Enzyme design. Structure first.
Site, mmCIF file in Angstrom:
data_model
loop_
_atom_site.group_PDB
_atom_site.id
_atom_site.type_symbol
_atom_site.label_atom_id
_atom_site.label_comp_id
_atom_site.label_asym_id
_atom_site.label_seq_id
_atom_site.Cartn_x
_atom_site.Cartn_y
_atom_site.Cartn_z
ATOM 1 N NE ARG A 1 2.248 -7.459 5.790
ATOM 2 C CZ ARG A 1 2.511 -6.030 5.861
ATOM 3 N NH1 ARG A 1 1.927 -5.505 4.520
ATOM 4 N NH2 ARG A 1 2.874 -5.476 6.630
ATOM 5 C CB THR B 1 -9.113 3.164 7.532
ATOM 6 O OG1 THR B 1 -8.299 1.955 7.295
ATOM 7 C CG2 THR B 1 -10.049 3.332 6.176
ATOM 8 C CG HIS C 1 7.054 6.887 -5.816
ATOM 9 N ND1 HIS C 1 8.132 6.605 -4.684
ATOM 10 C CD2 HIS C 1 6.596 5.778 -6.187
ATOM 11 C CE1 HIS C 1 8.173 5.336 -4.671
ATOM 12 N NE2 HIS C 1 7.432 4.593 -5.501
ATOM 13 C CD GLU D 1 -5.755 8.918 10.922
ATOM 14 O OE1 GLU D 1 -4.810 9.629 11.388
ATOM 15 O OE2 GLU D 1 -6.755 8.479 11.797
#
Lengths: 179, 180, 180
Positions: free
Chosen positions: B9, B31, B46, B58
């Protein structure tokens, strides 16, 4: 004297050693046997570099080695401050349960040893580098000893940083001059 | 390539994205599934506003597969996250045995091999590669045997990528610090 | 306002203090008793060796009540510590219920809503505002459920205040680093 700090496996020694270089005669002060061994291990194979590096295992009465009787061409590599602390903790705490320890007083004794170190460093003409670890950017330990260790460990580093001419923060093997 | 490190964070993922910038073609390599589903959702939004093409994939093994030489220098690649990739490999390498019985030295080299393939697959790559990782060694030594190891492995994995990075960023409280 | 961060026992308050310098009137806002219990004692000891007048008060809610639009540009404010403030809110928002029955998402909103106030408050407040927080996301992921969340929420908060700060400082082992 220059202080080098960083997290676990952040590459601080490599940098700390980079700090030293080509000063043929060097003294390695190791806080754990585990550390005194890895060194005297590479200094049997290392012929490679023209350096006559010397080790000694110790975390007490540093003034004995960090002498003034050393040439200003000589360098000193001390590692690691935190293991010093932990060690001190154990012996200072005696044969008692960490549950029943005088953390305010233990803290004091360590400080002492710290002041001595800091002191001996002022009277030594040689280059002295100290390696330490950052252990306070995580969450608050559950364990009791651990909680204290973290505080004390952090306060000790404050002293050092202050007595340090230079301060290096190593992150991911990338050295950053803070002081 | 470019390396973005920071804590949990710290806002590195937002920093990294800004690094890529106004690129036309962007490949996001997650990942892990959450990361993938995570971005798969963002893009659906977006998508219309912006005029840059984004897509996901992935993969946390054999990145040379995605980090190829036939890519344009205008193209871009955002990889997130290197630490999950690491743990991911640990479980895989460890297979079906109880983590206690693991040979961490060996698994570690396997992982090193895996990183070497991306380090090198980044080298030949013309497209801008951005690598997002995590700092996890500024806290106290874990009691849990597995964590202790991971902590190390992950620290050494980082040193390597950093030495390969042409640029290194440290993101603190969302604030980026160019340390390389 | 200005933000100060670093680890536990990093020397963040000292720097915080050396940041206000010689502001005539200073107000310390402790987010805890202990925080207040020391600043107080520490004030008493230096109250004669320091011209500036220092005062204390405990608060971690509706800070806009302390941070007002009627203070002097020379007035100072040293609020410490943000993270203890988040902990305090959590428990308060969760309360009677066991943490495992906690709705973190809903608790995160209430919290932010508390962050804005303080943030919006500093904008209005004509005095020099200095905030202290901790960096708790550079370790290994915690097993304790509530901790895991706290770390998360704490980083996200650090980002909120960081964006709004005018200056951002990083403290490591006593030495400060202006990152913003």
């Amino acid at each position: 004297m220059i202080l080098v700090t960083g997290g676990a496996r952040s590459g601080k020694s490599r940098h700390a050693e980079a700090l030293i270089g080509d000063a043929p005669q060097v003294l390695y002060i190791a806080t754990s046997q585990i550390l005194d061994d890895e060194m005297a291990a590479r200094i049997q194979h290392h012929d490679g570099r023209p350096a006559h590096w010397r080790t000694a295992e110790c975390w007490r009465h540093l003034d004995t080695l960090i002498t003034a009787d050393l040439a200003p061409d000589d360098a000193i590599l001390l590692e690691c401050i935190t293991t010093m602390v932990t060690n001190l903790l154990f012996a200072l705490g005696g044969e008692n349960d960490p549950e029943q320890w005088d953390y305010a007083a233990m803290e004091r004794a360590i400080d002492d040893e710290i002041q001595i170190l800091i002191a001996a460093c002022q009277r030594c003409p040689a280059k002295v580098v100290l390696v330490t670890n950052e252990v306070g950017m995580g969450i608050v330990p559950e364990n009791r000893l651990a909680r204290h260790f973290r505080d004390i460990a952090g306060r000790v580093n404050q002293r050092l940083a202050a007595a340090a001419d230079e301060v290096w923060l190593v992150v991911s093997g990338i050295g950053v001059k803070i002081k």
